[PDB]
Amino acid sequence: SMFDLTGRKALVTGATGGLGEAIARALHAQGAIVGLHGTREEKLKELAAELGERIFVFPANLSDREAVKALGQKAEEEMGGVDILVNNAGITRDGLFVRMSDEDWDAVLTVNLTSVFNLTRELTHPMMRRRNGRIINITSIVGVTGNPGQANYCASKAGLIGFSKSLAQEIASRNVTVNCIAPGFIESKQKDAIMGNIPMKRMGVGADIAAAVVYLASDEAAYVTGQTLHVNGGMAMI
Amino acid sequence: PGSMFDLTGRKALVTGATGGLGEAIARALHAQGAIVGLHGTREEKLKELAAELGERIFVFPANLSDREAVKALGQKAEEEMGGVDILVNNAGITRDGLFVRMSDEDWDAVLTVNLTSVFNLTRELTHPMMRRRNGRIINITSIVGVTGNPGQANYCASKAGLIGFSKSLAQEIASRNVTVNCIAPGFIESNEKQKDAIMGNIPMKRMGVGADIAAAVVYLASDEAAYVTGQTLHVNGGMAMI
Amino acid sequence: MFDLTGRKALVTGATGGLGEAIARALHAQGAIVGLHGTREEKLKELAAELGERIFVFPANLSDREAVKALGQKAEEEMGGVDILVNNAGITRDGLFVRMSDEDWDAVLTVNLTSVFNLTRELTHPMMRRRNGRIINITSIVGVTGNPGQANYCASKAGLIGFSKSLAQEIASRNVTVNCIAPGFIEKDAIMGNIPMKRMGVGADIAAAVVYLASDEAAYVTGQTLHVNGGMAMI
Amino acid sequence: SMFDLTGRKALVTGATGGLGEAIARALHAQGAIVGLHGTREEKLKELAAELGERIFVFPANLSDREAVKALGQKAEEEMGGVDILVNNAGITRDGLFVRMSDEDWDAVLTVNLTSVFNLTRELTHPMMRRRNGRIINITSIVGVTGNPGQANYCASKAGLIGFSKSLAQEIASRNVTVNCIAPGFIEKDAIMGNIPMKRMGVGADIAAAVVYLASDEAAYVTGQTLHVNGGMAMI
Numbered sequence: 022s023m024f025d026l027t028g029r030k031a032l033v034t035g036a037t038g039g040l041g042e043a044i045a046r047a048l049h050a051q052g053a054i055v056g057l058h059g060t061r062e063e064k065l066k067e068l069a070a071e072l073g074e075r076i077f078v079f080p081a082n083l084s085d086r087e088a089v090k091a092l093g094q095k096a097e098e099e100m101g102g103v104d105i106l107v108n109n110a111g112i113t114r115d116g117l118f119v120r121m122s123d124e125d126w127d128a129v130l131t132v133n134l135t136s137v138f139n140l141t142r143e144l145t146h147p148m149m150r151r152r153n154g155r156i157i158n159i160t161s162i163v164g165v166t167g168n169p170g171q172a173n174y175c176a177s178k179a180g181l182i183g184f185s186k187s188l189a190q191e192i193a194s195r196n197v198t199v200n201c202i203a204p205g206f207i208e209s210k211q212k213d214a215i216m217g218n219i220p221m222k223r224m225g226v227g228a229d230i231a232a233a234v235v236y237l238a239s240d241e242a243a244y245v246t247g248q249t250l251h252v253n254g255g256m257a258m259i
Numbered sequence: 260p261g262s263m264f265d266l267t268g269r270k271a272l273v274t275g276a277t278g279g280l281g282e283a284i285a286r287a288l289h290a291q292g293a294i295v296g297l298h299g300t301r302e303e304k305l306k307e308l309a310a311e312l313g314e315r316i317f318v319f320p321a322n323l324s325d326r327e328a329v330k331a332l333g334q335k336a337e338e339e340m341g342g343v344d345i346l347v348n349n350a351g352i353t354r355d356g357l358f359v360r361m362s363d364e365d366w367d368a369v370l371t372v373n374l375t376s377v378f379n380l381t382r383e384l385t386h387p388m389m390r391r392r393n394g395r396i397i398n399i400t401s402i403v404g405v406t407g408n409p410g411q412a413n414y415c416a417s418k419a420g421l422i423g424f425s426k427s428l429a430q431e432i433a434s435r436n437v438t439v440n441c442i443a444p445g446f447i448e449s450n451e452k453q454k455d456a457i458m459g460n461i462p463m464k465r466m467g468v469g470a471d472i473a474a475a476v477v478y479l480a481s482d483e484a485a486y487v488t489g490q491t492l493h494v495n496g497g498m499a500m501i
Numbered sequence: 502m503f504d505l506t507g508r509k510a511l512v513t514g515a516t517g518g519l520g521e522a523i524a525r526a527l528h529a530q531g532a533i534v535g536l537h538g539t540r541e542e543k544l545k546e547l548a549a550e551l552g553e554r555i556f557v558f559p560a561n562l563s564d565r566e567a568v569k570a571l572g573q574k575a576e577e578e579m580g581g582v583d584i585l586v587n588n589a590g591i592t593r594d595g596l597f598v599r600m601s602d603e604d605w606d607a608v609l610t611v612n613l614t615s616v617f618n619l620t621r622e623l624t625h626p627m628m629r630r631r632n633g634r635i636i637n638i639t640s641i642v643g644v645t646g647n648p649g650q651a652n653y654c655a656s657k658a659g660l661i662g663f664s665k666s667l668a669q670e671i672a673s674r675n676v677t678v679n680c681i682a683p684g685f686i687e688k689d690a691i692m693g694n695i696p697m698k699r700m701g702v703g704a705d706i707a708a709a710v711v712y713l714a715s716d717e718a719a720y721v722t723g724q725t726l727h728v729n730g731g732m733a734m735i
Numbered sequence: 736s737m738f739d740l741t742g743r744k745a746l747v748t749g750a751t752g753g754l755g756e757a758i759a760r761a762l763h764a765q766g767a768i769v770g771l772h773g774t775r776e777e778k779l780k781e782l783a784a785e786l787g788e789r790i791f792v793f794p795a796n797l798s799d800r801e802a803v804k805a806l807g808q809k810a811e812e813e814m815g816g817v818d819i820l821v822n823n824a825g826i827t828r829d830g831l832f833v834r835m836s837d838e839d840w841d842a843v844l845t846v847n848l849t850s851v852f853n854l855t856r857e858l859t860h861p862m863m864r865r866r867n868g869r870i871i872n873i874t875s876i877v878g879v880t881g882n883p884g885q886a887n888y889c890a891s892k893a894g895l896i897g898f899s900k901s902l903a904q905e906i907a908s909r910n911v912t913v914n915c916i917a918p919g920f921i922e923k924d925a926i927m928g929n930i931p932m933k934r935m936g937v938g939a940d941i942a943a944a945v946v947y948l949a950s951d952e953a954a955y956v957t958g959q960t961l962h963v964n965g966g967m968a969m970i
Binding site: 170 | 831832835849852855859863878879880882886891893897905958
Binding site for chain 3: 737738761764765900903904905907908910919930931932933934936937939940943944946947950952953954955956957958959960961962963964965966969970
């Protein structure tokens with residue numbers, strides 16, 4: 022069958038979150054062996070139990086650089102080699118830029134970009150040694166449009182794309198692709214305002230993003246690298 | 260049915276289905292359980308591909324230069340397949356050469372087939388799709404529509420226009436659960452100085468194959484891609500990164 | 502800086518809001534400006550006003566032979582066009598499902614094919630002079646898409662694709678080709694999507710044309726300059 | 736005259752480097768009062784000497800967070816309000832991603848993005864108060880294209896653009912614009928082969944783009960990325 026991920030090992034960060042969970046479900050549904058990263062092992066273990074077999078659980082605080090490294094090493098070790106890394110864990114520290122503290126900036130950049138750097142660095146050379154890999158970075162519509170109140174988040178998510186393109190160029194000839202998915206507004210006055218800019222006039226759901234992950238993760242998407250797949254109900258058209 | 264990216268019973272029309280990409284697209288769509296309308300110009304080669312795949316296939320010869328034939332194509336496909344769910348606008352032509360040497364005919368031919376024939380074919384099938392509250396319009400553009408490419412002023416205009424067309428249309432028909440998206444192939448296997456030089460620009464250091472494009476078509480055609488519209492999916496070995 | 506003294510500029514749609522503002526800025530920067538339009542009276546008016554360094558070139562841009570005659574006329578009479586501003590554009594707005602062949606055809610013909618032809622008239626001369634500026638006024642909508650404008654969007658998106666291709670061809674000849682994408686130029690529905698919360702004026706686009714036309718933008722080619730109050734951010 | 740910057744106060748970071756010098760010279764030629772930032776005072780005083788009038792000199796280590804903040808406060812103070820901030824100073828720590836140290840990554844992200852965030856934060860509220868401002872960020876072609884050996888640099892430069900867009904959205908109604916210039920290759924045959932113009936950019940190519948975005952005439956331009964690259968990438 023097509024887009025079959027049977028036997029592929031996938032690590033999904035922020036897997037307890039709505040998107041992470043959906044992504045983890047789709048990969049699992051496609052035969053993947055899925056490592057669920059989160060901060061709280063209890064919640065991860067529940068997801069693990071609800072999904073069933075072919076699941077690993079890997080708690081780690083992604084703001085802790087040594088724990089990010091240990092996470093990559095542990096997932097790589099216990100899964101017997103990670104083939105698919107889904108960098109999905111992200112944080113926001115929303116707020117107007119002029120009120121934006123160093124910590125709100127630093128926290129978002131550290132988790133959303135630097136932790137991704139480090140986790141990816143743990144797994145990239147292993148994937149190239151195996152001459153097969155998928156790095157799939159969950160960015161946001163907002164990394165390409167901008168969004169007020171999100172100078173930090175936008176910088177990190179845009180940075181994540183730039184990071185991805187560079188890495189893509191570097192490791193492409195070794196059969197590791199690196200791509201981004203840019204969710205629009207996903208179910209997780211204000212709503213109507215956002216909805217007004219969505220041609221489809223519905224929120225996204227985790228499964229919208231999860232299917233794009235499976236697509237990118239698949240053997241069939243081996244010729245796709247350095248790309249940003251916009252899954253956003255037409256909210257921004259690239 | 261209900262499995263991931265399943266297209267069982269979905270009716271797809273593929274233009275330029277005898278070509279490299281078109282054939283791969285038709286095969287992948289067919290493999291995914293789709294009923295496939297094979298468009299081409301050489302009715303023979305069409306019937307021959309129809310025979311290889313066997314069942315769930317229609318053959319639809321048409322000259323896409325001929326605006327009335329394009330209109331007939333869409334109507335015939337809409338009728339005989341019992342409604343088209345998936346339109347893959349894949350057929351395209353080139354009339355390459357420097358702009359300073361580029362005749363009115365070279366320009367007109369490329370724009371009419373690559374853009375206008377797409378507008379017309381799409382116009383035939385769009386409302387039917389909207390009435391069905393389900394459709395996929397998948398337009399095969401080119402990396403070159405986004406990058407530019409010397410010797411292809413006409414082709415680049417047509418392929419860039421195709422994208423702008425798709426974005427406008429995606430916006431109009433999104434509330435009707437008809438998506439419209441483009442796939443931008445990079446250089447797809449279809450002298451050693453030329454190939455060497457193109458490959459030097461492809462991070463992956465290999466040519467694409469039809470199946471690379473076909474799989475992107477299956478993805479966008481899928482129910483799972485219901486929240487994707489107005490987008491351009493670059494399948495190019497990293498040759499341009501958007 | 503950004504001096505265009507003695508540069509010959511041909512501005513299509515020069516009688517309209519943008520075209521007029523463009524012509525004015527170019528003239529203000531020392532350019533000799535060829536004013537294209539269909540309204541001969543409005544052309545004479547602007548010419549009489551700007552005074553010196555003006556040529557007037559009426560042409561129906563739907564008429565292909567007339568487009569070529571325009572390019573030839575401006576090249577011959579201006580003594581070599583240095584700057585072509587393709588600004589003239591039409592809409593035939595309407596939902597795609599009701600969109601006639603003629604509404605599509607007319608928009609693509611004028612917005613894309615007439616640009617193709619005018620540009621072809623002037624390209625080899627510019628290249629022969631190893632100096633030129635082709636500046637194409639596209640639209641935000643060519644990048645974003647817009648409902649009601651499947652034709653216009655296609656033409657303006659296509660205008661950009663054309664420009665990139667041409668830019669790569671002729672860059673070594675010191676002829677640059679660039680697009681400017683105005684946002685909304687003189688509905689609170691529209692301004693709701695514009696961070697700046699005001700409309701663009703012709704002078705906003707005119708200044709962008711002067712920048713791209715300038716010797717100082719000699720290293721800028723194949724690009725799209727978005728002048729849209731933040732309405733879309735590329 | 737058009738694109739006049741007379742009486743505009745500009746702060747240019749990395750003003751002693753290739754681009755920075757060219758930018759500061761173009762701003763000065765257009766009548767701007769230019770604050771020259773750099774790491775070494777000797778270099779800065781040299782540039783200031785030759786430019787003569789309407790110059791300030793602000794040395795600062797941009798990798799030092801408190802120096803960055805002090806820089807912004809000092810410039811805003813001594814210049815009587817900064818109208819134009821040109822974030823131009825950036826560093827590289829190039830190398831294979833598999834060999835990329837935390838230090839190589841951190842250093843580039845801190846200088847190229849975080850120091851920009853802090854410098855910009857120092858000057859944004861003032862500009863917004865005045866209802867006038869230009870934040871002009873020097874990114875790189877490579878922030879849009881990617882480039883091997885620069886995972887860190889490309890992340891920083893792409894992130895710079897995303898930052899700029901978000902900020903542009905936030906402060907646009909206060910008529911403070913924020914834009915990026917993406918220089919291509921500024922003054923090997925492999926590189927040149929991908930440049931349609933078949934020449935390197937010079938500092939002036941970038942400075943002129945800075946003058947344009949800084950101008951009142953570019954008041955309707957925000958959240959944008961102006962690519963100045965001889966056609967090397969066409970967006």
